């Protein structure tokens, strides 16, 4: 049970930042970036479909598709963070930023686990994070480093999201009971790491890192901002409405 | 002129026309007018079938759409290289296309109302598109046949996949049958349209067919697309909306319904379904997105 | 708002011997044609080589 | 004294379809570095495209 | 290390070695000197054979001649920008080469005294470079490997023009014969100390050898080049000046006698027979050719 | 005889010319001028062949050989500016430069010839005669338009050439005879297309056409300068020593 939801954990955090980042399709600012947008979608999507296959296994019953589409919000377990909408691309970038630079800590960890199955999905997984973290503090960097109006939509941006960002850090049972067993890797032990990249980044924008404490968690726990609900309304619709199909 | 001579010899011996070489101001133009279109359809393209991505019914379809809309993105930048091979810029091609004053597909001025018009353009309209390309693998101008070559290989794997979404819904229940055929109806005729006019009413023809930009006049590749196609249709046991449409064993092909030429003109000159709703986000995109670009210049000055 | 001029992008495959024009793109810098020429062109497989090059900086022969 | 930069040619043979790299050479600009390669790798053959770019104009991909 | 072991292994695995990827400063190095030597040797290698250009006997062997000579050049201008991937500059290394801190082939410091010289040049010369050069062709760097194979498609025409060469003497009036046997006489040990020292007084061979820059030992190369030319110079009805050559039965392949190596030390060294007159020329050319170079950089920047 | 005389002196240009570029092989300014040179020489060695080659079969016996290597000064017919010292590169430069004008205005209308042969010899040469002239013509301008002392060294052999462009011009019985047969080109007709080539490319190089009044003919005659003797004495050494062979 602790291993199904730590891997359901995962699995959801890529699932609905995936989603996020399909919104985009075909409105970004450039082609180019269309395209990498896309890309890092999909690459996300595929993270999604092997940890949420994983989850399904462990339980005994169902799949992907039935856990993509058939629970509701109180039982999707992603951060607050990947569920925050699009806004200006300042607001994608730094949600972007955040998560990958978190992705790289994390799975560089979980490719040790003493789970096989945990430690190949994240084995294939870093080196997408990798592709994902370049591209994000890149834009990181054009963006706040750029012009006068580009470097203040990239720290309000930076200011916008930080509360979400203690959730990266917070340990509950399943964390620290699997990372005792050697399974899981124990988020508090990420900040460092994080921190490193993340305070190195916005420095090298020419930003500020918020001074604000940050405070917000809960969606690990079924406890989601006002976000979630219509994201699951949209993504969810057509197997509602025709359950039980194949496609 | 010798120069206009040594061109029209070039043509008929089938030698590729290169970036370098002479051309009629007419074919340069020409070129940069349907390239350019071209391009500027997959764009658009991403956006009925985008529309879906956040809705689509599997894990697995909606990986497929995707890629497949990813892949389109990319297929529009081979194609604006390829303009700009004949000295057009990108980005001044990409404003007429905001200002109405570079087309794009009939086709994407369509709406998408169900989950199965996903499958049936992947099917249909990419089908369309594949007809087409193929045809133009061996146009006279070498950057646009090497685009062509380079574009099907991927476009054809996506055709496929949207059949075969067509065909998960063809074999389930029977709402999921309905929903297909239904789709079929508002999706057949549009995209026989993709084909261009007829061949008596098109302007392009005369001198695309002449230069060899175009290898098959637009009746002979529609023609091409039902001959192909019915036997597709007919797999997925659903019916063409074409009261008119019966096999004619004689010509050994199929004999089709005509065209609503009047709907086609509405939709090319901007009074289509959706026509207002694609320029729209395309110019909400670029208007929107333009801090993002200005941004990433003054970056990459310093 | 930036400028996206014209790169033109070689490729060297995995058991690839040397690179090859496989087309052309627009892009703000030589960074970000690296990054669009690795999705576009390549789809990031590894132990491929690419090389960008703005098309400014290419003279051709004269037919 | 002259400066002999470093160029990077590139050749697509008369029923070649795209460009491959083929060599370096050293020359003092884009014309001399033609004119050399046109005899270094080409030998004058009709209908052979050749490209030549310096090689500070190429960014390369990251082992 | 980690970055040393990985090359260790990809060294193991016959990975090509590629400008981009991490070497050991030591292989680095080892190239620069190696392939900058061989670059070196094509330029030098003009003057022995150029100095007949205005002499040969007839306008076929005259213009087979000059191809040769220009084809050489064209090897050395491949063999620079190898050299250049590896970070060092043609300007720096062929400054090092006038100065005498670089070498080139010991070959290029011996005299042609005949016109029968220039057509076993072509034949035993161009046979030694032709058999280490096919050996390089899986040498571990990618560059070099690739302008080894380059190279050797050329060069074996022309050894083959040398060889044809040789057979007109060796078919013709007894003055050609004798020319040509006095040629042999010359040339014979000067041609096999190109493959380099002893495999006991190599220092590196154990790093190359390793590295997988050298793949097979001088004295490798040396003996197949004693055993395919043996047979070549039986056709042309000459001897060896080698009192103990012989076939070995036993071991398949010829016997044949000690290199002078004092000799081979002092031509290494600077004290052939033309070293000073080959480096007069070479700096001759480059001082004088001063105000062209720099008349081409005045020119270029207006 | 009129034919074979005046296909002989076309056939010896080349020849000599040849001769002096490959004095050339290994001591240029640049590798790459060192090739461009020997690929001249090997070009206008080419068209010697041609040339001597058809002469020898006008004239019912010998062949390019016997015609190269058994003449003496008095019976080669090229044009005394092919036999001039190589001299510095400019004076290099300067030679070839009026040379390939001549051939360009020269072979662009012996194409035409009413000699099949002719017309078929000179077709060849005007294709790679092009590429000289872009090569010398190139350089002309890179001297004289470089430095200070590149644009003495370009004017000083501009000058020292001069008086042996009138031999370009120059038409004898055979000239007149061949060209009135629809056979040959009436040197003095090519004056126009020489001058207009020659005079626009030493204005744009920034340099001078010499006021001095070109005087020197003599070698179409086997009238040489003291240059030609030492130049066949060196070219035909081992033929002299070692005749009727095969090479
Ligand atoms: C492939 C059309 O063949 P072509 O030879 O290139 O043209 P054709 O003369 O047959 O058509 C006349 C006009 O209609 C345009 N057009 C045709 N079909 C479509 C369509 N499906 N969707 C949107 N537009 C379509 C076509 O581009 C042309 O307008 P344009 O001259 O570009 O302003
Ligand atoms: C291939 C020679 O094999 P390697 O493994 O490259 O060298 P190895 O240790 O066998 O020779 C010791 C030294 O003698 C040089 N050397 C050898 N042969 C010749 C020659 N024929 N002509 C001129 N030089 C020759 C060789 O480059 C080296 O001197 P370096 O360390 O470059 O100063």
């Known amino acids: ?247 | 002129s010798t120069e206009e001579q040594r061109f029209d010899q070039r043509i008929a011996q089938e030698t590729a026309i290169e970036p370098q070489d002479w051309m009629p101001d007419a074919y340069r133009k020409t070129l940069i007018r349907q390239i350019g279109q071209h391009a500027h359809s997959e764009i658009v393209g991403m956006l009925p079938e985008g529309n879906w991505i956040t809705r689509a019914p599997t894990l697995r379809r909606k990986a497929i759409l995707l890629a497949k809309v990813q892949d389109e993105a990319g297929h529009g930048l081979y194609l604006y290289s390829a303009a700009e091979t004949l000295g057009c810029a990108r980005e001044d091609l990409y404003q007429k296309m905001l200002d109405g004053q570079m087309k794009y597909s009939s086709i994407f001025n369509y709406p998408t109302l169900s989950w199965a018009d996903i499958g049936v353009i992947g099917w249909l309209v990419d089908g369309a598109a594949i007809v087409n390309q193929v045809a133009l693998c061996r146009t006279s101008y070498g950057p646009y046949a090497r685009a062509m070559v380079k574009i099907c290989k991927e476009e054809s794997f996506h055709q496929r996949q949207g059949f075969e979404a067509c065909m998960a819904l063809a074999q389930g229940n029977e709402a999921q049958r309905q929903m297909l055929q239904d789709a079929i109806n508002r999706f057949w005729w549009p995209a026989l349209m993709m084909f261009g006019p007829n061949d008596d009413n098109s302007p392009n023809s005369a001198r695309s067919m002449a230069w060899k930009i175009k290898l098959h006049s637009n009746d002979e590749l529609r023609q091409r697309f039902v001959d192909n196609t019915v036997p597709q249709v007919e797999i997925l046991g659903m019916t063409v909306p074409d009261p008119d449409l019966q096999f004619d064993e004689a010509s050994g092909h199929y004999r089709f319904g005509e065209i609503d030429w009047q709907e086609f003109n509405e939709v090319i000159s901007g009074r289509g379904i959706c026509n207002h709703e694609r320029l729209a986000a395309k110019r909400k995109a670029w208007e929107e997105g333009e801090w993002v670009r200005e941004a990433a210049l003054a970056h990459a000055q310093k | 708002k930036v400028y996206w001029p014209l790169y033109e992008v070689f490729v060297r495959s995995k058991q690839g011997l040397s690179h090859r024009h496989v087309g052309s793109l627009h892009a703000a810098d030589d960074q970000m044609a690296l990054e669009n020429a690795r999705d576009a062109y390549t789809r990031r497989s590894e132990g491929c080589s690419i090389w960008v090059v703005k098309a400014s900086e290419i003279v051709a022969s004269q037919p």
């Open chain 1, 1 to 247: 049970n602790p291993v199904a939801t730590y891997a359901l954990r995962l699995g959801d955090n890529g699932l609905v930042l995936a989603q996020r980042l399909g919104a985009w399709c075909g409105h970004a600012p450039e082609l180019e970036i269309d395209l990498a947008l896309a890309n890092i979608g999909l690459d996300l999507l595929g993270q999604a479909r092997n940890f949420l296959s994983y989850a399904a296994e462990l339980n005994g019953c169902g799949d992907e598709d039935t856990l993509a589409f058939g629970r509701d919000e109180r039982q999707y377990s992603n951060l607050l963070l990947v569920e925050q909408p699009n806004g200006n691309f300042a607001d994608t970038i730094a949600r972007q930023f955040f998560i990958d630079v978190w992705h790289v800590a994390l799975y560089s960890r979980l490719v040790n686990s003493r789970d096989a199955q945990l430690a190949a999905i994240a084995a294939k997984g870093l080196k997408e994070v990798r592709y994902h973290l370049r591209f994000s503090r890149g834009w990181l960097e054009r963006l706040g480093n750029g012009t006068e109006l580009s470097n203040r939509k990239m720290q309000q941006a930076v200011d916008n999201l930080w509360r979400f960002t203690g959730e990266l850090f917070l340990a509950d049972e399943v964390e620290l009971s699997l990372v005792e067993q050697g399974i899981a890797v124990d988020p508090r032990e990420l900040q460092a790491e994080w921190q490193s990249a993340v305070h190195t980044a916005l420095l090298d924008s020419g930003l500020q890192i918020p001074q604000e404490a940050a405070f917000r968690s809960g969606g690990k726990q079924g406890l989601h901002s006002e976000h979630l609900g219509p994201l699951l309304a949209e993504m969810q619709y057509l197997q509602r409405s025709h359950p039980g199909l194949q496609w």
